[PDB]
Amino acid sequence: KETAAAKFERQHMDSSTSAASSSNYCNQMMKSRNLTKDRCKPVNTFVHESLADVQAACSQKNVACKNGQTNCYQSYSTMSITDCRETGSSKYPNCAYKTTQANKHIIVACEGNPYVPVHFDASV
């Protein structure tokens, strides 16, 4: 099985581009990261920063997660992110995504040793 930290990396990291290329960024990335394999993941955010900077958020501002857990952290600085969400025309096996690029703080849940990101909670 995939570890929690590795699943977070695969689903949420894109350190190779500074920001979403075109409107087709999400269709390509959701496919590349295997998030459209058996079904279309409905919503998924990619962060365009180094893995180190995203991991460093786990020692930044401790805040509540939406589900009430207390292991969430909000990055002190804004980061380049792209939110990918299915459009109305999306239907497996023909997934289709809207690409929205933004610069916002990220909120992640962290766990383990090393204490690293295991869930992407929200962007602010």
Considering the complex, what minimum distance in angstroms separates the CB of residue 39 from Cl ion?
15
Catalytic residue list contains 105? no
Residue 45 or 55: which CB sits closer to Cl ion?
45
Kindly state the smallest distance separating residue 46's Cβ from Cl ion, in Å. Answer: 9
Residues that bind Cl ion (CB under 5 A): 3, 5-6, 16, 19, 44-45, 80, 101, 103, 120
Q: Is 39 annotated as a binding residue?
A: no
Tokens 């992640």 correspond to what residue?
108
Q: Which of 79, 90, 85, 112 is nearest to 100 (CA)?
A: 85
Binding residue per annotation — 67? no
Q: Active site residue: 8, 12, 35, 72, which one?
A: 12
Tokens of 26: 């999400």
- Considering the candidates 26, 35, 119, 123, report the single residue annotated as catalytic: 119
Give the Cα separation of 13 and 24 in Å (integer). Answer: 17
Beta-bridge mates of residue 20: none
Tell me the closest approach of the beta carbon of residue 22 to Cl ion, in angstroms.
Answer: 14
d(CA 30, CA 96): 9
Q: Which is nearer to Cl ion, 41 or 60 (CB)?
A: 41
At residue 61's C-alpha, the angle toward residues 59 and 65, to 5°, is 105
Considering beta carbons, is residue 60 or 101 the nearer one to Cl ion? 101
Name every residue whose Cβ is closer than 8 Å to that of residue 2 and which is 6 or more positions away in sequence: 10
Catalytic annotation, residues? 12, 119
